[PDB]
Amino acid sequence: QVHLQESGPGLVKPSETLSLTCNVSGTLVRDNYWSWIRQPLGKQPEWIGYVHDSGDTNYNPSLKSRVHLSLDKSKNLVSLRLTGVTAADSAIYYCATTKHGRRIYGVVAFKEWFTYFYMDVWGKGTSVTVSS
Amino acid sequence: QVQLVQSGAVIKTPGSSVKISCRASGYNFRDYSIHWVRLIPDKGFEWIGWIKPLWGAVSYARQLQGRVSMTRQLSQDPDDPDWGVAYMEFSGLTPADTAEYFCVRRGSCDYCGDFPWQYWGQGTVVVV
Amino acid sequence: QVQLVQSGAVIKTPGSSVKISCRASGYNFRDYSIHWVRLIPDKGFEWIGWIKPLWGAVSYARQLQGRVSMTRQLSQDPDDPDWGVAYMEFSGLTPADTAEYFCVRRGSCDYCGDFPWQYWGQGTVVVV
Amino acid sequence: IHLENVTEEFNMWKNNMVEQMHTDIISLWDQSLKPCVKLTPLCVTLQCTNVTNNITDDMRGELKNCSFNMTTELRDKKQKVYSLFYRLDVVQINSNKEYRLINCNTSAITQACPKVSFEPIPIHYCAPAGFAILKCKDKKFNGTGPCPSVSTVQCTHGIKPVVSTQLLLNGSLAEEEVMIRSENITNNAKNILVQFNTPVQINCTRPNNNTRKSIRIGPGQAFYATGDIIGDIRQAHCNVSKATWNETLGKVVKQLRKHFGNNTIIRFANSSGGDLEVTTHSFNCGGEFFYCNTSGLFNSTWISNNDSITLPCRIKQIINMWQRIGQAMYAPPIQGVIRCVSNITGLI
Amino acid sequence: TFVSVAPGQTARITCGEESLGSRSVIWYQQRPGQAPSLIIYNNNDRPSGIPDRFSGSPGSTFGTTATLTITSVEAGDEADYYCHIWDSRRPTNWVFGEGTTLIVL
Ligand SMILES: *[C@@H]1O[C@H](CO)[C@@H](O[C@@H]2O[C@H](CO)[C@@H](O[C@@H]3O[C@H](CO[C@H]4O[C@H](CO[C@H]5O[C@H](CO)[C@@H](O)[C@H](O)[C@@H]5O)[C@@H](O)[C@H](O[C@H]5O[C@H](CO)[C@@H](O)[C@H](O)[C@@H]5O)[C@@H]4O)[C@@H](O)[C@H](O[C@H]4O[C@H](CO)[C@@H](O)[C@H](O)[C@@H]4O[C@H]4O[C@H](CO)[C@@H](O)[C@H](O)[C@@H]4O[C@H]4O[C@H](CO)[C@@H](O)[C@H](O)[C@@H]4O)[C@@H]3O)[C@H](O)[C@H]2NC(C)=O)[C@H](O)[C@H]1NC(C)=O
Ligand SMILES: *[C@@H]1O[C@H](CO)[C@@H](O[C@@H]2O[C@H](CO)[C@@H](O[C@@H]3O[C@H](CO[C@H]4O[C@H](CO)[C@@H](O)[C@H](O)[C@@H]4O)[C@@H](O)[C@H](O[C@H]4O[C@H](CO)[C@@H](O)[C@H](O)[C@@H]4O[C@H]4O[C@H](CO)[C@@H](O)[C@H](O)[C@@H]4O)[C@@H]3O)[C@H](O)[C@H]2NC(C)=O)[C@H](O)[C@H]1NC(C)=O
Ligand SMILES: *[C@@H]1O[C@H](CO)[C@@H](O[C@@H]2O[C@H](CO)[C@@H](O[C@@H]3O[C@H](CO[C@H]4O[C@H](CO)[C@@H](O)[C@H](O)[C@@H]4O)[C@@H](O)[C@H](O[C@H]4O[C@H](CO)[C@@H](O)[C@H](O)[C@@H]4O)[C@@H]3O)[C@H](O)[C@H]2NC(C)=O)[C@H](O)[C@H]1NC(C)=O
Ligand SMILES: *[C@@H]1O[C@H](CO)[C@@H](O[C@@H]2O[C@H](CO)[C@@H](O[C@@H]3O[C@H](CO)[C@@H](O)[C@H](O[C@H]4O[C@H](CO)[C@@H](O)[C@H](O)[C@@H]4O)[C@@H]3O)[C@H](O)[C@H]2NC(C)=O)[C@H](O)[C@H]1NC(C)=O
Ligand SMILES: *[C@@H]1O[C@H](CO)[C@@H](O[C@@H]2O[C@H](CO)[C@@H](O[C@@H]3O[C@H](CO)[C@@H](O)[C@H](O[C@H]4O[C@H](CO)[C@@H](O)[C@H](O)[C@@H]4O)[C@@H]3O)[C@H](O)[C@H]2NC(C)=O)[C@H](O)[C@H]1NC(C)=O
Ligand SMILES: *[C@@H]1O[C@H](CO)[C@@H](O[C@@H]2O[C@H](CO)[C@@H](O[C@@H]3O[C@H](CO)[C@@H](O)[C@H](O)[C@@H]3O)[C@H](O)[C@H]2NC(C)=O)[C@H](O)[C@H]1NC(C)=O
Ligand SMILES: *[C@@H]1O[C@H](CO)[C@@H](O[C@@H]2O[C@H](CO)[C@@H](O[C@@H]3O[C@H](CO)[C@@H](O)[C@H](O)[C@@H]3O)[C@H](O)[C@H]2NC(C)=O)[C@H](O)[C@H]1NC(C)=O
Ligand SMILES: *[C@@H]1O[C@H](CO)[C@@H](O[C@@H]2O[C@H](CO)[C@@H](O[C@@H]3O[C@H](CO)[C@@H](O)[C@H](O)[C@@H]3O)[C@H](O)[C@H]2NC(C)=O)[C@H](O)[C@H]1NC(C)=O
Ligand SMILES: *[C@@H]1O[C@H](CO)[C@@H](O[C@@H]2O[C@H](CO)[C@@H](O)[C@H](O)[C@H]2NC(C)=O)[C@H](O)[C@H]1NC(C)=O
Ligand SMILES: *[C@@H]1O[C@H](CO)[C@@H](O[C@@H]2O[C@H](CO)[C@@H](O)[C@H](O)[C@H]2NC(C)=O)[C@H](O)[C@H]1NC(C)=O
Ligand SMILES: *[C@@H]1O[C@H](CO)[C@@H](O[C@@H]2O[C@H](CO)[C@@H](O)[C@H](O)[C@H]2NC(C)=O)[C@H](O)[C@H]1NC(C)=O
Ligand SMILES: *[C@@H]1O[C@H](CO)[C@@H](O[C@@H]2O[C@H](CO)[C@@H](O)[C@H](O)[C@H]2NC(C)=O)[C@H](O)[C@H]1NC(C)=O
Ligand SMILES: *[C@@H]1O[C@H](CO)[C@@H](O[C@@H]2O[C@H](CO)[C@@H](O)[C@H](O)[C@H]2NC(C)=O)[C@H](O)[C@H]1NC(C)=O
Ligand SMILES: *[C@@H]1O[C@H](CO)[C@@H](O)[C@H](O)[C@H]1NC(C)=O
Ligand SMILES: *[C@@H]1O[C@H](CO)[C@@H](O)[C@H](O)[C@H]1NC(C)=O
């Protein structure tokens, strides 16, 4: 049994370095991968990327620079840092674990395979809105 | 091998004109004749006509002349000399023309005649 | 006639790599082996290796493997089927590698083996 | 029919009839091209780009999408056509990117007619009236000297013509032992033929589904080219059985040590280098060539006391086999997914 | 993007790009006012909790589009659907597909 608790200001000025934190329930932050997802209203979500210790810290190459994912093993939280909030940045954001899996179609020794992902559990959300 | 792919069944109105193609593959298409033949139930077989595709020289059965039309298409490339498409446009349909049709090719031995039809199509039934 | 033009002498630093070309003319270059061989004073001769230019099939002496590289260039035009260039890129230079080098070709009789080297280059002395 | 009380010295090394056979096969090879079509209008500027794939920035794809101008049936009409090519047949000429075929600076080029196949058929050689053909029926025969068990014949047995730069395929195999043959073993630059007894299977495939595309060059002309590739972009390869390869290498190491001292260490290495088609073994499968890396086999050592072996291939279209001077050969792309199974017979 | 069926019937919800290579489709659904929720995590696999009859297209078919077959639908099936395709040939879809809403009578 896990459930995650997003936390952020909600009302953000433009060109402001946003941060969010995410509280856990039971399962410690070491054991599993972590991921953030955004979604505008009435739209499909955009998977922002995934974070985990030991190099498993890939980002969306759309932004790729103005976002910084991190974990807190001392406090057992999930931290996001952002840079430069713009008008399209008003969206509901989600912290969530994910589980991988090797989709394999040929000779494994020839790298003829890849790793999908899927967010098994979800957060609760925080309606971030950018305004002045 | 000799492959004689026809087209499938179809339903037409009386007085119409049906068109059956017959694609032949696996042999030199310019060298052998093509016969059409039919099967009405409780009537036996009835010969229809033949065509040589080298020029398309045809000959029809007498009691169906003015109605049947046979054409062909060769394959002209230096890669595929094998396949060739015979046609049959049968005009002036009656419900009595409801029957199963066949495109056939003769045997290839030296003592093979012309009517001992060796290779056979899969049969195309047309109901009016 | 058989003409085997090497390149002249050169001085290189230790740990460097030298490149000796060997241009052969007067015969069908695609048909005979090319041997590289060496001469150190007060050490006698030492065989380095051979190369077939038809595919560039090489073989090296054992105690110099990893250090030597033999390539070739054929002449591809319908006017000059005769001249062809062998190379030798020798890597990992020591001052003990100071020596005279040779590219040679075998004899062309029927009882000629492969090592009875008939035709010889003019020799190239490299000092490290 | 057999012949008795008879001593005859043979030699495979000063033997003829390999010379005129090597003449005749290349002769019939050239007889199989004069009906076929030239590609002289095809050597042209090529706008090439990477194939549609999730690209790895550090590894490289081996298929290029090349669009170019081409003639039509009519002279005044020019057209824009694309196809796919391997990396190993285009080079870069010089910002933007423009490639060309590698042979088009230095040679002409001929497409093979897709009617003709490249599978072997057994050729029986025979002698005319006034000559006879002999055959050494001995079990052990290293290849030089007398043979007491001989018999004449009128025509040779089935010989299928293969093309394999190493690892001679589908050949005739020895009776009981594993035999090794040479001209002079103490000479090193002379090769060593290894006819091993038991055949060992190989699977080889290209798993990619392949669509061809006809291109009319001019009046009544034709040209075939790799169109779309449906499915997973994969890599061609070959497999052999592990323990069979180990046991056959044990047999040949058992047979080698007669010649090189009984207390001798024998190991193997990959081939030193040279041309691409001598660093591998190079074969034909279904009328399409393979140059397939062999370093996964000759990497072992030997002391005086369900798995397989997989190995990756590469596919070229244009060749210059027997290394001709201005003569080249295009190979047409073939449909579907190609695999073939061959009995590996000998080694070189 | 709106599909209406009678409750208890069958339904097909399609999403995303046509198949180029082998794929790993992932299906989410979205009740209004909730988070997303996974239903199908492989080409035709489902985790615990979700019932059956949520069929998916097999990942080996070449040149088809990702489908989601829901037989014997219900009003609790009224949620937005999301494809998440993972082609071996196309790059990583950092955004999802299109949200088609399944509404019931
Ligand atoms: C030369 O030799 C080399 C090796 O020496 C050869 O190389 C091999 O070549 C073959 C063929 O090219 C490759 O096969 C593919 O293998 C992958 C991987 O298969 C493994 O993993 C599967 C899944 O893993 C799950 O289970 C394992 C434990 O089993 C677990 O550890 C793991 O975490 C995960 O949970 C296993 O199921 C699979 O087992 C299968 O094979 C066993 C062999 O004996 C058999 O015992 C099992 O019962 C089972 O049958 C194996 O461990 C496969 O994934 C792949 O098959 C998929 O992809 C092709 C692509 O087109 C597709 O056609 C197949 O139908 C299949 O796709 C189905 O499964 C997908 C899984 O997600 C699914 O997404 C698809 O939609 C599709 O699913 C549909 O069908 C299934 C029923 O089949 C159904 O359940 C679904 O709901 C849906 O309807 C290939 O088979 C080898 O990888 C490769 N390398 C090696 C090392 O072997 C080479 O071929 C040789 N060359 C020659 C010329 O011979
Ligand atoms: C070592 O020795 C082995 C033993 O011979 C040898 O394996 C054989 O290789 C050949 C060529 O790679 C294989 O021949 C091909 O086989 C397939 C399969 O069909 C045959 O097998 C089935 C079942 O066994 C039979 O029912 C069937 O009747 C066949 O006998 C065929 O599909 C191939 O035919 C095509 O290629 C020919 C090449 O000219 C054409 O003439 C032929 O008409 C087919 O081409 C046409 O169709 C294609 C598809 O549409 C099209 O693209 C073409 O353009 C054309 O229109 C071919 O006969 C043979 O099966 C192998 N033997 C076994 C037992 O599998 C190894 O190759 C050899 N090693 C080496 C290195 O050579
Ligand atoms: C015939 O087949 C054999 C085996 O099947 C091939 O042998 C191997 O060939 C490769 C390259 O040809 C050898 O080199 C290896 O290359 C890898 C790729 O390098 C890229 O990526 C690394 C980072 O991953 C970069 O640093 C690099 O610049 C390249 O961008 C390397 O990753 C390998 O390093 C591995 O091994 C070393 C040594 O153990 C480790 O220190 C590393 O951490 C890493 O694990 C390596 O350098 C490879 O070594 C060959 N195999 C063997 C057993 O020797 C032949 O190449 C093939 N023939 C032909 C003609 O291709
Ligand atoms: C399409 O192809 C791309 C090819 O770049 C592919 O991207 C890569 O995928 C892998 C796995 O999906 C990513 O993750 C790697 O996984 C291993 C296994 O755990 C890790 O060890 C790796 O970490 C190493 O590499 C990092 C980056 O080089 C280092 O920072 C780290 O310290 C380790 O050395 C690594 O996490 C991999 O990151 C991506 N690469 C990129 C550039 O995105 C993609 O997945 C393919 N997509 C599809 C749908 O096929
Ligand atoms: C090799 O490179 C050539 C370069 O010309 C390439 O041919 C072109 O590929 C593109 C993409 O595959 C083709 O564009 C498509 O064309 C078809 C036919 O008109 C359209 O139906 C397609 O529309 C779909 O995708 C759109 C994307 O937004 C959707 O909006 C739309 O709803 C459809 O789903 C798409 O426009 C282009 O037509 C070809 N050109 C030619 C002349 O074929 C070729 O595909 C490459 N091949 C390989 C193997 O890499
Ligand atoms: C196939 O053949 C056509 C016809 O020759 C080639 O198209 C031509 O390409 C040149 C250079 O790429 C073009 O010149 C440039 O045109 C642009 C656009 O007007 C202009 O901005 C530049 O300053 C320069 O003039 C030329 O216009 C173009 N002509 C046509 C009719 O397309 C083409 O490059 C060939 N290759 C392919 C892959 O299509
Ligand atoms: C390949 O095998 C053949 C036999 O099948 C070898 O031919 C003969 O081999 C023997 C011993 O191996 C040679 O005998 C030697 O003869 C000399 C002088 O006659 C004698 O002084 C020695 O003590 C020894 O008895 C014999 O000469 C040889 N025959 C020929 C024609 O060479 C053959 O040597 C083997 N191949 C190689 C490359 O060794
Ligand atoms: C026989 O085995 C040796 C050793 O495994 C092989 O040598 C290796 O060849 C590869 C291919 O060149 C070398 O990889 C490196 O690739 C990068 C790519 O950019 C290049 O920059 C490097 O300079 C180097 O080429 C590898 O280092 C090399 N290893 C050694 C020890 O030399 C050899 O290829 C095998 N023979 C055959 C025919 O494959
Ligand atoms: C070559 O092209 C010509 C004309 O484009 C073709 O001739 C006509 O083709 C149409 C069908 O496209 C037929 O309806 C006409 O009856 C044909 N006319 C004649 C005089 O034959 C011709 O069939 C084409 N040939 C090939 C091999 O493609
Ligand atoms: C024909 O041109 C090609 C490419 O311009 C030449 O191939 C390359 O030539 C360069 C030197 O200019 C070498 O460094 C490369 O190794 C060559 N590549 C290949 C694949 O051979 C080719 O040598 C030229 N041939 C003639 C006879 O002029
Ligand atoms: C390679 O891809 C082609 C794509 O067309 C496959 O051909 C189709 O195969 C299916 C099922 O066998 C048929 O229903 C289609 O009619 C075929 N289309 C055509 C144009 O022939 C082919 O089967 C694939 N080959 C392999 C080995 O997967
Ligand atoms: C040739 O064989 C040797 C040993 O059989 C292979 O050596 C392997 O080297 C790697 C180093 O990265 C080790 O991790 C492996 O454990 C070694 N293999 C064994 C069996 O111990 C070598 O890779 C082989 N050559 C090739 C080209 O694969
Ligand atoms: C390769 O050689 C093997 C040698 O065993 C062949 O296998 C036997 O072939 C004969 C005649 O071809 C058959 O009567 C036997 O039944 C085969 N044995 C087995 C166990 O199948 C094999 O056919 C040859 N060819 C190929 C393509 O593998
Ligand atoms: C094209 O090829 C080059 C070199 O192989 C590669 O770096 C690049 O990623 C490829 N793709 C594009 C879109 O340029
Ligand atoms: C080498 O071994 C074989 C048997 O393996 C033996 O018959 C032979 O005499 C040995 N040779 C020497 C020189 O010991």
Author numbering:
A (entry chain 5): 1 to 82, 82A, 82B, 82C, 83 to 100, 100A, 100B, 100C, ...
B (entry chain q), C (entry chain 8): 1 to 52, 52A, 53 to 76, 76A, 76B, 76C, 76D, 76E, ...
D (entry chain 2): 84 to 141, 150 to 185, 187 to 309, 312 to 321, 321A, 322 to 398, 411 to 453
E (entry chain 6): 8 to 9, 11 to 67, 67A, 67B, 67C, 68 to 95, 95A, 95B, ...
Give the text the authors published on this PDB structure.
The broadest of these vaccine-elicited fusion peptide-directed antibodies (vFP antibodies) derive from a class of murine antibodies, the vFP1 class, whose members share similar B cell ontogenies and structural modes of recognition. While the murine vFP1 class antibodies share VH gene sequence homology with the human VH gene of VRC34.01, the binding mode and antibody contact sites of the vFP antibodies are different from that of VRC34.01.
To further understand the structural basis for development of antibody breadth for the vaccine-elicited antibodies, we determined cryo-EM structures of two additional vFP antibodies of the vFP1 class, vFP1.01 and vFP7.04 (8% and 10% breadth, respectively), in complex with BG505 DS-SOSIP Env trimer. By using a similar strategy as was adopted for the cryo-EM reconstructions of Env-bound complexes of vFP16.02 and vFP20.01, we obtained cryo-EM reconstructions, at overall resolutions of 4.2 Å and 4.0 Å, respectively, of vFP1.01-BG505 DS-SOSIP-VRC03-PGT122 and vFP7.04-BG505 DS-SOSIP-VRC03-PGT122 complexes, where the antigen binding fragments (Fabs) of antibodies PGT122 and VRC03 were added to increase the size of the complex and to provide fiducial markers allowing better particle visualization and alignment. The cryo-EM reconstructions revealed vFP1.01 and vFP7.04 bound to a helical fusion peptide, in what appears to be a signature for this class of vaccine-elicited, murine antibodies. Buried surface area calculations using the coordinates fitted and refined into the cryo-EM reconstructions revealed a 1.2–1.7-fold larger interfacial buried surface for the light chain than the heavy chain. Although the light chain made a larger footprint on Env than the heavy chain in the vFP1.01, vFP7.04, vFP16.02 and vFP20.01 complexes, closer examination of the electron density revealed greater disorder in the light chain density in all the structures. This suggests local variability in the position of the bound light chain that was less constrained by its interactions with Env, whereas the heavy chain made a more stable interface, albeit with a smaller footprint, interacting primarily with the fusion peptide with some interactions with glycan 88.
